[PDB]
């Protein structure tokens, strides 16, 4: 019989109410079986039930009316569906139960119901089984109506050996002994939720717990050897859940919240309702070895996953085209919450960096609107990108500054209350925010890609403003909430620009004007006539006349304008010279973010002399700030992050005072047999210098197997990827790909670091090409992991030959990668790199030879 349904989306006329899932995993044979019972009703007469199933071996399917009838099973593996045919049509509105018996193999990927492993201190391999369903992998563990708008309650039962613990979304009601060495755990019924949020883990994890003031038991789960690193996340999770409950005025509805650190995990974390899961590096904190960056990362990742309990779980997007309703909000709420719960982290100052990263992809033709259509699993996975997360958060921040925090908060509380246990579209959010023209304005920011360039022309008191789509002509127009300050006023002045152009009149003439105050708006600014000269003069003479975020926005925008010929490279580089006086993390890092990519392009070309001169200029520019750093872990989180990055930068570029100190610390660390406690903040620099020799690299690698510290593992991995030894770089690719000595969850990062190694970069792009099929099988087409490997190995090329290697390779893949959005993005980036280098290389050579810092 041919397949009776020819659409990717399921029919809307058969709706589930409740699922009873029985799962029995065998961790010795790596197999599982299940029985899924789903209560359904049909809104129209049908004899066919279409549902999702992927890589499950279905043995039997029956239909119970409320008698039992057998169902004929048909499969459509490409659509990832099964069709269950009943002997007679279902009666409308009457309850039926579909019962499906099946078996599967535990996935060897990081999705579905997959295998995870770890080693004990004695070298014994331990196996656990965990889940990762978002977006479409629930259908790999149980047959279901696997679309987020088909919400249902779930009663989960897990069969296991007595040596294992099982945890799931809800608390454990009871454990029944079925037979010898066979226990069945019954978990309480969940509230109405999407299939992608179902979770279960079978392991020998240990836990620590703490109860919130609202009575919620919060626990952190981890392997026995790492449960002593769970205290920080446990305390942070309790404080953040209490923050969100008080903030939203909507209690967390479940009796418990678990945070599990999984030894193998693809993304950073996942918000499964009641059972949030994390990479061990995103949750576990070692008070002696963890970095300030990693502590910030745990805090923000926990805040993100807990925000999703409201934004994503309680209220879910109707379809993946509106995935930003979940991810943009969760990303933005990390800042809203942590700014209050952990004020010592000063996160609010760092938000804007995400917006500049989103602008890098959003300035290309291959970007997409925040809300855009998706059909198949690879396209849906492509929605987990910088546009949904970072542009999503940045436009919400822009809107909050525009409406005020009070009006914005009222709109989001109304929205969550109105749509609790249901699904929403982009329009529902805008109607909630307008109930406090929001919809017209925010449609310009979510229903078309990109962002505007705002051009300012000052004629005495007359300030002319123009908008145009910034693209590296569509005729796009936005409702832009402009802000500005002047040399006469530091009040934030506002002007809503809804037309191509407008003009305003200043009360008095000014010496300078600066738009996008604190860079809270998702747009860039160009100043005509002497505007850039006036702003450059202000930064050179009195840089604290504007805030550190305003200084960072001027640096970023000046370099973005060079790409479209609005500002010469010489004038942008002249502006950057003020950084010799800068002390603040955001503008110092913004200077690095703009300048470092220039020598990354030179490293992949025969441009050694200008590359070396450019690197010497960068070190000279920040020399006073580098020399002021102590080689300790002293200071605030920003002082520590600034120290670590500056010392690492100085050492990799052979700045002699720092290389000598790093060389001495590494030699002493190796002499001590790795017992010397180095300051965590200098460890990246010390290890990167030490790995340059064969003996140093082998010694660093010998310590890797014993480490229980996520930071130490990450620091060693970074250092090992910096060697000039090509056999060692190849070995890291081969071993992390294999997953024994270095876990495969680190492969995408290792591949990108080697792709950025000045001598070993050809090896990363070659490895990706030669192992494409296995990498796609492990990480999936459309995944953020694949996108980071594609862009990480190719987006710093700047020759027509490299451009054609990329086009030729990906077009030869046909259905296994030729249509990837990351491929078009990297092709467009290489085209821009070719043009930028051709135009600016010798201009930079001449500018460097002028030695303006030495003048
Ligand atoms: O360049 C990189 C990585 N990287 C890029 O590949 C270009 S975008 C970028 C912007 C800011 C910071 C790092 C960036 N890392 C270092 C390098 O020269 O390879 C320099 C910094 C010390 C670590 C090594
Ligand atoms: Br049974
Ligand atoms: Br505003
Ligand atoms: Br005038
Ligand atoms: Br010191
Ligand atoms: Br090849
Ligand atoms: Zn998220």
JSON list of N, CA, C and O in Angstrom, two decimals, residues 191-225:
[
{"chain": "A", "resi": 191, "resn": "UNK", "atom": "N", "xyz": [2.51, 18.14, 33.65]},
{"chain": "A", "resi": 191, "resn": "UNK", "atom": "CA", "xyz": [1.49, 19.07, 33.17]},
{"chain": "A", "resi": 191, "resn": "UNK", "atom": "C", "xyz": [1.50, 18.94, 31.60]},
{"chain": "A", "resi": 191, "resn": "UNK", "atom": "O", "xyz": [2.38, 18.26, 31.02]},
{"chain": "A", "resi": 192, "resn": "UNK", "atom": "N", "xyz": [0.55, 19.62, 30.92]},
{"chain": "A", "resi": 192, "resn": "UNK", "atom": "CA", "xyz": [0.44, 19.69, 29.45]},
{"chain": "A", "resi": 192, "resn": "UNK", "atom": "C", "xyz": [1.77, 20.31, 28.93]},
{"chain": "A", "resi": 192, "resn": "UNK", "atom": "O", "xyz": [2.18, 21.39, 29.40]},
{"chain": "A", "resi": 193, "resn": "UNK", "atom": "N", "xyz": [2.45, 19.62, 28.01]},
{"chain": "A", "resi": 193, "resn": "UNK", "atom": "CA", "xyz": [3.72, 20.12, 27.49]},
{"chain": "A", "resi": 193, "resn": "UNK", "atom": "C", "xyz": [4.02, 19.49, 26.14]},
{"chain": "A", "resi": 193, "resn": "UNK", "atom": "O", "xyz": [3.40, 18.52, 25.74]},
{"chain": "A", "resi": 194, "resn": "UNK", "atom": "N", "xyz": [5.04, 20.03, 25.47]},
{"chain": "A", "resi": 194, "resn": "UNK", "atom": "CA", "xyz": [5.47, 19.51, 24.17]},
{"chain": "A", "resi": 194, "resn": "UNK", "atom": "C", "xyz": [6.35, 18.26, 24.31]},
{"chain": "A", "resi": 194, "resn": "UNK", "atom": "O", "xyz": [7.11, 18.12, 25.26]},
{"chain": "A", "resi": 195, "resn": "UNK", "atom": "N", "xyz": [6.32, 17.40, 23.28]},
{"chain": "A", "resi": 195, "resn": "UNK", "atom": "CA", "xyz": [7.14, 16.17, 23.26]},
{"chain": "A", "resi": 195, "resn": "UNK", "atom": "C", "xyz": [8.62, 16.44, 23.39]},
{"chain": "A", "resi": 195, "resn": "UNK", "atom": "O", "xyz": [9.34, 15.64, 24.01]},
{"chain": "A", "resi": 196, "resn": "UNK", "atom": "N", "xyz": [9.10, 17.59, 22.84]},
{"chain": "A", "resi": 196, "resn": "UNK", "atom": "CA", "xyz": [10.54, 17.86, 22.88]},
{"chain": "A", "resi": 196, "resn": "UNK", "atom": "C", "xyz": [11.10, 18.06, 24.31]},
{"chain": "A", "resi": 196, "resn": "UNK", "atom": "O", "xyz": [12.32, 18.04, 24.50]},
{"chain": "A", "resi": 197, "resn": "UNK", "atom": "N", "xyz": [10.23, 18.25, 25.30]},
{"chain": "A", "resi": 197, "resn": "UNK", "atom": "CA", "xyz": [10.64, 18.48, 26.68]},
{"chain": "A", "resi": 197, "resn": "UNK", "atom": "C", "xyz": [10.68, 17.23, 27.54]},
{"chain": "A", "resi": 197, "resn": "UNK", "atom": "O", "xyz": [11.11, 17.31, 28.69]},
{"chain": "A", "resi": 198, "resn": "UNK", "atom": "N", "xyz": [10.25, 16.07, 27.01]},
{"chain": "A", "resi": 198, "resn": "UNK", "atom": "CA", "xyz": [10.30, 14.81, 27.75]},
{"chain": "A", "resi": 198, "resn": "UNK", "atom": "C", "xyz": [11.77, 14.45, 27.98]},
{"chain": "A", "resi": 198, "resn": "UNK", "atom": "O", "xyz": [12.58, 14.62, 27.07]},
{"chain": "A", "resi": 199, "resn": "UNK", "atom": "N", "xyz": [12.11, 13.99, 29.18]},
{"chain": "A", "resi": 199, "resn": "UNK", "atom": "CA", "xyz": [13.49, 13.63, 29.48]},
{"chain": "A", "resi": 199, "resn": "UNK", "atom": "C", "xyz": [13.56, 12.52, 30.48]},
{"chain": "A", "resi": 199, "resn": "UNK", "atom": "O", "xyz": [12.68, 12.37, 31.34]},
{"chain": "A", "resi": 200, "resn": "UNK", "atom": "N", "xyz": [14.61, 11.70, 30.34]},
{"chain": "A", "resi": 200, "resn": "UNK", "atom": "CA", "xyz": [14.86, 10.63, 31.28]},
{"chain": "A", "resi": 200, "resn": "UNK", "atom": "C", "xyz": [16.33, 10.23, 31.20]},
{"chain": "A", "resi": 200, "resn": "UNK", "atom": "O", "xyz": [16.94, 10.28, 30.12]},
{"chain": "A", "resi": 201, "resn": "UNK", "atom": "N", "xyz": [16.91, 9.88, 32.35]},
{"chain": "A", "resi": 201, "resn": "UNK", "atom": "CA", "xyz": [18.32, 9.54, 32.42]},
{"chain": "A", "resi": 201, "resn": "UNK", "atom": "C", "xyz": [18.47, 8.32, 33.30]},
{"chain": "A", "resi": 201, "resn": "UNK", "atom": "O", "xyz": [17.87, 8.26, 34.38]},
{"chain": "A", "resi": 202, "resn": "UNK", "atom": "N", "xyz": [19.23, 7.33, 32.85]},
{"chain": "A", "resi": 202, "resn": "UNK", "atom": "CA", "xyz": [19.48, 6.11, 33.62]},
{"chain": "A", "resi": 202, "resn": "UNK", "atom": "C", "xyz": [20.97, 6.12, 33.86]},
{"chain": "A", "resi": 202, "resn": "UNK", "atom": "O", "xyz": [21.75, 6.12, 32.89]},
{"chain": "A", "resi": 203, "resn": "UNK", "atom": "N", "xyz": [21.38, 6.16, 35.12]},
{"chain": "A", "resi": 203, "resn": "UNK", "atom": "CA", "xyz": [22.80, 6.32, 35.42]},
{"chain": "A", "resi": 203, "resn": "UNK", "atom": "C", "xyz": [23.15, 5.88, 36.88]},
{"chain": "A", "resi": 203, "resn": "UNK", "atom": "O", "xyz": [22.30, 5.37, 37.59]},
{"chain": "A", "resi": 204, "resn": "UNK", "atom": "N", "xyz": [24.37, 6.20, 37.34]},
{"chain": "A", "resi": 204, "resn": "UNK", "atom": "CA", "xyz": [24.73, 6.03, 38.74]},
{"chain": "A", "resi": 204, "resn": "UNK", "atom": "C", "xyz": [25.15, 7.41, 39.31]},
{"chain": "A", "resi": 204, "resn": "UNK", "atom": "O", "xyz": [26.06, 7.52, 40.14]},
{"chain": "A", "resi": 205, "resn": "UNK", "atom": "N", "xyz": [24.47, 8.48, 38.86]},
{"chain": "A", "resi": 205, "resn": "UNK", "atom": "CA", "xyz": [24.74, 9.85, 39.29]},
{"chain": "A", "resi": 205, "resn": "UNK", "atom": "C", "xyz": [24.48, 10.02, 40.78]},
{"chain": "A", "resi": 205, "resn": "UNK", "atom": "O", "xyz": [23.62, 9.36, 41.35]},
{"chain": "A", "resi": 206, "resn": "UNK", "atom": "N", "xyz": [25.23, 10.92, 41.41]},
{"chain": "A", "resi": 206, "resn": "UNK", "atom": "CA", "xyz": [24.96, 11.34, 42.79]},
{"chain": "A", "resi": 206, "resn": "UNK", "atom": "C", "xyz": [24.28, 12.73, 42.73]},
{"chain": "A", "resi": 206, "resn": "UNK", "atom": "O", "xyz": [24.21, 13.35, 41.66]},
{"chain": "A", "resi": 207, "resn": "UNK", "atom": "N", "xyz": [23.73, 13.19, 43.86]},
{"chain": "A", "resi": 207, "resn": "UNK", "atom": "CA", "xyz": [23.05, 14.48, 43.88]},
{"chain": "A", "resi": 207, "resn": "UNK", "atom": "C", "xyz": [23.23, 15.23, 45.18]},
{"chain": "A", "resi": 207, "resn": "UNK", "atom": "O", "xyz": [23.59, 14.65, 46.21]},
{"chain": "A", "resi": 208, "resn": "UNK", "atom": "N", "xyz": [23.03, 16.54, 45.11]},
{"chain": "A", "resi": 208, "resn": "UNK", "atom": "CA", "xyz": [22.99, 17.47, 46.22]},
{"chain": "A", "resi": 208, "resn": "UNK", "atom": "C", "xyz": [21.68, 18.24, 46.00]},
{"chain": "A", "resi": 208, "resn": "UNK", "atom": "O", "xyz": [21.27, 18.42, 44.85]},
{"chain": "A", "resi": 209, "resn": "UNK", "atom": "N", "xyz": [21.02, 18.66, 47.09]},
{"chain": "A", "resi": 209, "resn": "UNK", "atom": "CA", "xyz": [19.75, 19.35, 46.97]},
{"chain": "A", "resi": 209, "resn": "UNK", "atom": "C", "xyz": [19.56, 20.49, 47.97]},
{"chain": "A", "resi": 209, "resn": "UNK", "atom": "O", "xyz": [20.21, 20.52, 49.02]},
{"chain": "A", "resi": 210, "resn": "UNK", "atom": "N", "xyz": [18.66, 21.40, 47.64]},
{"chain": "A", "resi": 210, "resn": "UNK", "atom": "CA", "xyz": [18.33, 22.58, 48.42]},
{"chain": "A", "resi": 210, "resn": "UNK", "atom": "C", "xyz": [16.87, 22.94, 48.06]},
{"chain": "A", "resi": 210, "resn": "UNK", "atom": "O", "xyz": [16.48, 22.81, 46.90]},
{"chain": "A", "resi": 211, "resn": "UNK", "atom": "N", "xyz": [16.08, 23.37, 49.04]},
{"chain": "A", "resi": 211, "resn": "UNK", "atom": "CA", "xyz": [14.68, 23.73, 48.80]},
{"chain": "A", "resi": 211, "resn": "UNK", "atom": "C", "xyz": [14.50, 25.25, 48.68]},
{"chain": "A", "resi": 211, "resn": "UNK", "atom": "O", "xyz": [15.06, 26.00, 49.49]},
{"chain": "A", "resi": 212, "resn": "UNK", "atom": "N", "xyz": [13.74, 25.72, 47.67]},
{"chain": "A", "resi": 212, "resn": "UNK", "atom": "CA", "xyz": [13.49, 27.16, 47.52]},
{"chain": "A", "resi": 212, "resn": "UNK", "atom": "C", "xyz": [12.52, 27.65, 48.63]},
{"chain": "A", "resi": 212, "resn": "UNK", "atom": "O", "xyz": [11.84, 26.83, 49.24]},
{"chain": "A", "resi": 213, "resn": "UNK", "atom": "N", "xyz": [12.37, 28.98, 48.79]},
{"chain": "A", "resi": 213, "resn": "UNK", "atom": "CA", "xyz": [11.42, 29.51, 49.76]},
{"chain": "A", "resi": 213, "resn": "UNK", "atom": "C", "xyz": [9.97, 29.14, 49.38]},
{"chain": "A", "resi": 213, "resn": "UNK", "atom": "O", "xyz": [9.13, 29.07, 50.26]},
{"chain": "A", "resi": 214, "resn": "UNK", "atom": "N", "xyz": [9.69, 28.85, 48.07]},
{"chain": "A", "resi": 214, "resn": "UNK", "atom": "CA", "xyz": [8.39, 28.40, 47.58]},
{"chain": "A", "resi": 214, "resn": "UNK", "atom": "C", "xyz": [8.17, 26.87, 47.75]},
{"chain": "A", "resi": 214, "resn": "UNK", "atom": "O", "xyz": [7.11, 26.37, 47.40]},
{"chain": "A", "resi": 215, "resn": "UNK", "atom": "N", "xyz": [9.15, 26.14, 48.27]},
{"chain": "A", "resi": 215, "resn": "UNK", "atom": "CA", "xyz": [9.01, 24.71, 48.52]},
{"chain": "A", "resi": 215, "resn": "UNK", "atom": "C", "xyz": [9.46, 23.79, 47.40]},
{"chain": "A", "resi": 215, "resn": "UNK", "atom": "O", "xyz": [9.26, 22.58, 47.50]},
{"chain": "A", "resi": 216, "resn": "UNK", "atom": "N", "xyz": [10.09, 24.32, 46.35]},
{"chain": "A", "resi": 216, "resn": "UNK", "atom": "CA", "xyz": [10.57, 23.49, 45.24]},
{"chain": "A", "resi": 216, "resn": "UNK", "atom": "C", "xyz": [11.90, 22.84, 45.62]},
{"chain": "A", "resi": 216, "resn": "UNK", "atom": "O", "xyz": [12.83, 23.54, 45.99]},
{"chain": "A", "resi": 217, "resn": "UNK", "atom": "N", "xyz": [12.01, 21.52, 45.48]},
{"chain": "A", "resi": 217, "resn": "UNK", "atom": "CA", "xyz": [13.29, 20.85, 45.75]},
{"chain": "A", "resi": 217, "resn": "UNK", "atom": "C", "xyz": [14.16, 20.99, 44.48]},
{"chain": "A", "resi": 217, "resn": "UNK", "atom": "O", "xyz": [13.83, 20.42, 43.44]},
{"chain": "A", "resi": 218, "resn": "UNK", "atom": "N", "xyz": [15.29, 21.65, 44.60]},
{"chain": "A", "resi": 218, "resn": "UNK", "atom": "CA", "xyz": [16.21, 21.81, 43.47]},
{"chain": "A", "resi": 218, "resn": "UNK", "atom": "C", "xyz": [17.39, 20.87, 43.75]},
{"chain": "A", "resi": 218, "resn": "UNK", "atom": "O", "xyz": [17.88, 20.84, 44.88]},
{"chain": "A", "resi": 219, "resn": "UNK", "atom": "N", "xyz": [17.78, 20.06, 42.77]},
{"chain": "A", "resi": 219, "resn": "UNK", "atom": "CA", "xyz": [18.90, 19.14, 42.91]},
{"chain": "A", "resi": 219, "resn": "UNK", "atom": "C", "xyz": [19.86, 19.28, 41.71]},
{"chain": "A", "resi": 219, "resn": "UNK", "atom": "O", "xyz": [19.44, 19.56, 40.58]},
{"chain": "A", "resi": 220, "resn": "UNK", "atom": "N", "xyz": [21.13, 19.04, 41.97]},
{"chain": "A", "resi": 220, "resn": "UNK", "atom": "CA", "xyz": [22.11, 18.94, 40.90]},
{"chain": "A", "resi": 220, "resn": "UNK", "atom": "C", "xyz": [22.57, 17.49, 40.90]},
{"chain": "A", "resi": 220, "resn": "UNK", "atom": "O", "xyz": [22.96, 16.97, 41.95]},
{"chain": "A", "resi": 221, "resn": "UNK", "atom": "N", "xyz": [22.56, 16.84, 39.72]},
{"chain": "A", "resi": 221, "resn": "UNK", "atom": "CA", "xyz": [23.03, 15.49, 39.53]},
{"chain": "A", "resi": 221, "resn": "UNK", "atom": "C", "xyz": [24.35, 15.50, 38.76]},
{"chain": "A", "resi": 221, "resn": "UNK", "atom": "O", "xyz": [24.51, 16.27, 37.82]},
{"chain": "A", "resi": 222, "resn": "UNK", "atom": "N", "xyz": [25.29, 14.64, 39.15]},
{"chain": "A", "resi": 222, "resn": "UNK", "atom": "CA", "xyz": [26.58, 14.53, 38.44]},
{"chain": "A", "resi": 222, "resn": "UNK", "atom": "C", "xyz": [27.22, 13.16, 38.74]},
{"chain": "A", "resi": 222, "resn": "UNK", "atom": "O", "xyz": [26.83, 12.51, 39.72]},
{"chain": "A", "resi": 223, "resn": "UNK", "atom": "N", "xyz": [28.24, 12.73, 37.96]},
{"chain": "A", "resi": 223, "resn": "UNK", "atom": "CA", "xyz": [28.95, 11.48, 38.26]},
{"chain": "A", "resi": 223, "resn": "UNK", "atom": "C", "xyz": [29.58, 11.56, 39.67]},
{"chain": "A", "resi": 223, "resn": "UNK", "atom": "O", "xyz": [29.85, 12.66, 40.18]},
{"chain": "A", "resi": 224, "resn": "UNK", "atom": "N", "xyz": [29.71, 10.41, 40.37]},
{"chain": "A", "resi": 224, "resn": "UNK", "atom": "CA", "xyz": [30.23, 10.44, 41.74]},
{"chain": "A", "resi": 224, "resn": "UNK", "atom": "C", "xyz": [31.52, 11.25, 41.95]},
{"chain": "A", "resi": 224, "resn": "UNK", "atom": "O", "xyz": [31.56, 12.06, 42.88]},
{"chain": "A", "resi": 225, "resn": "UNK", "atom": "N", "xyz": [32.50, 11.15, 41.03]},
{"chain": "A", "resi": 225, "resn": "UNK", "atom": "CA", "xyz": [33.77, 11.88, 41.16]},
{"chain": "A", "resi": 225, "resn": "UNK", "atom": "C", "xyz": [33.65, 13.40, 40.93]},
{"chain": "A", "resi": 225, "resn": "UNK", "atom": "O", "xyz": [34.63, 14.09, 41.12]}
]
